[PDB]
Design a protein around this ligand. Structure first.
Ligand SMILES: NC(=O)c1ccc2cncc(NC(=O)Cc3cccc(Cl)c3)c2c1
Ligand SMILES: [Cl-]
Lengths: 296, 300
């Protein structure tokens, strides 16, 4: 029993964190095999990069200085070729995630990991993280068996306190650019399929006060979701929720009628899994994994 | 900016998790140097759990009855001893991945990270607090016994909790790494219940200071309070009494924000009276009590 916001064990990623210094700027890098990946803003980026030599980039792995022997740019990520392969390199892939998907973040400062938290890629492509100055280059990831799938690298904080970054191939999530200019996060929405998954997790843990005898059509629910700044629920989301529906005996559209009643009438002084708000940062897969105990 | 429930990086603890099997029971052990620490209830059957005599059960065991597995390697047990509710299995190999560590006993209100494990394999990490009633509101399934709680301040891992059992309300009970339980609990399947829980007042105050540091002041008011009047009101909402030690501990956050502790106590009194009125504080519609004054200073 119990339901916590749970991150993946961070050990496989900790063994990859390094410090990258270029001039006055110090940030974090990801050392995989013989390449160190970091935000290109550590340095017209092609014009700024052509003026740099390998010895201008100082890379520190623990108390050891790594020698940079090459450098190249891929989108908004700088790739520093080093003379030593990371002996701690885990099995890994670079994957691009979609809004609504969750991942763990290993927040780092000076190439030293300080904390790990779980979060979701918001529908507006920002993340509600917890980062201070020096956190740039911190990474987001998921784990599948023994394979680490790197999905995010931190680049900047927006004026509202939310965060923006890229996949590990340097492509930004969202309409952001890596420079000091007027940029704002778009109006955010609630991840509907995730709220539904969290309602199924509450039923599994013995919280059934919000259940009702009613059902709804997907069209009627989507009109209600549009009214309350909730993302549209598609047939794919309904299919994905299938296992949780079979486990609890509550049809997905039956759980939508509960969500509709919660949106129109509130919680009435009650909580669900210790929360007075509807939680949207647990995917259907996170709920099944936390209520089954899958290990890495 | 931002404020998240943040756990310590778990790598130093992952390299210590092993699987301990005794007969039909399989649970987790903590491998530090040449000793594997695990709940002594690994020697029990489900029947034995009503009134186990651990000394009588342990004397019937030999070293080869305990199967210890570290990854794909079987460790050889060369000795065994019991210390309170923890079993200490001497093994023939020192853990090469043993970090710098200490065993510390924490007090209610203190927070720590938990590395939840099954079959000696880590599955997840979360942050939690030792409740005033000595239970933890964890997320643990069958097989999670032996999972550990820790803090990593600087490069030293301070182990403070080992998971032993789930109570009927879904909350969890365990021991420090010397095998002494937190709370009036016993490793017996006897009728045991968590005492009435309360809110950790010093932690809610710390979290209100974190909100002010992140730019939010909507909840502040022009009033102050005496410590006694604050306690008379807060105890009516099931809040723990605030002591002079708590007021002293909040000193740095008071100096940073310019809001005296007893003025912050007056905003807390008002929040309990009024509720939030559709507003949130650091993305929460409830008053959060699982961040200590130390966690707020560390994260903000
Ligand atoms: N499904 C379960 O059996 C279950 C679920 C969540 C569980 C979460 N934590 C622990 C489990 N087990 C026990 O508490 C074992 C036990 C029993 C009595 C006395 C002691 Cl000291 C130990 C858990 C089991
Ligand atoms: Cl303590």
């Amino acid at each position: 029993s119990g339901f916590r916001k749970m991150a993946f064990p961070s050990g496989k990623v900790e063994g990859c964190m390094v410090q990258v210094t270029c001039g006055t700027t110090t940030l974090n890098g990801l050392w995989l095999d013989d390449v160190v990946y970091c935000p290109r803003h550590v340095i017209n980026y092609e014009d700024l990069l052509i003026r740099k030599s390998n010895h201008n980039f100082l890379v520190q792995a623990g108390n050891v200085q790594l020698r940079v022997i090459g450098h190249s740019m891929q989108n908004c990520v700088l790739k520093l070729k080093v003379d030593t392969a990371n002996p701690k390199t885990p099995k890994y892939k670079f994957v691009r995630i979609q809004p609504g998907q969750t991942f763990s973040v290993l927040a780092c400062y000076n190439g030293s990991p300080s904390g790990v938290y779980q979060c979701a890629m918001r529908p507006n492509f920002t993340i509600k993280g917890s980062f201070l100055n020096g956190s740039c280059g911190s990474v987001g990831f998921n784990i599948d068996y023994d394979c680490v799938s790197f999905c995010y690298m931190h680049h900047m904080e927006l004026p509202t306190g939310v965060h923006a970054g890229t996949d590990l191939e340097g492509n930004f999530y969202g309409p952001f650019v890596d420079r000091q200019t007027a940029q704002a996060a778009g109006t955010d929405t609630t991840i509907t399929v995730n709220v539904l998954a969290w309602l199924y997790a509450a039923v599994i843990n013995g919280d059934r006060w919000f259940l009702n005898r009613f059902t709804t059509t997907l069209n009627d629910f989507n009109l209600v979701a549009m009214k309350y700044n909730y993302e549209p629920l598609t047939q794919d989301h309904v299919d994905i929720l299938g296992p949780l529906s079979a486990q609890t005996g509550i049809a997905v559209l039956d759980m939508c009628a509960s969500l509709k009643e919660l949106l129109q009438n509130g919680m009435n002084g009650r909580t669900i899994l210790g929360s007075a708000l509807l939680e949207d940062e647990f995917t259907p897969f996170d709920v099944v994994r936390q209520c089954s105990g899958v290990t890495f």
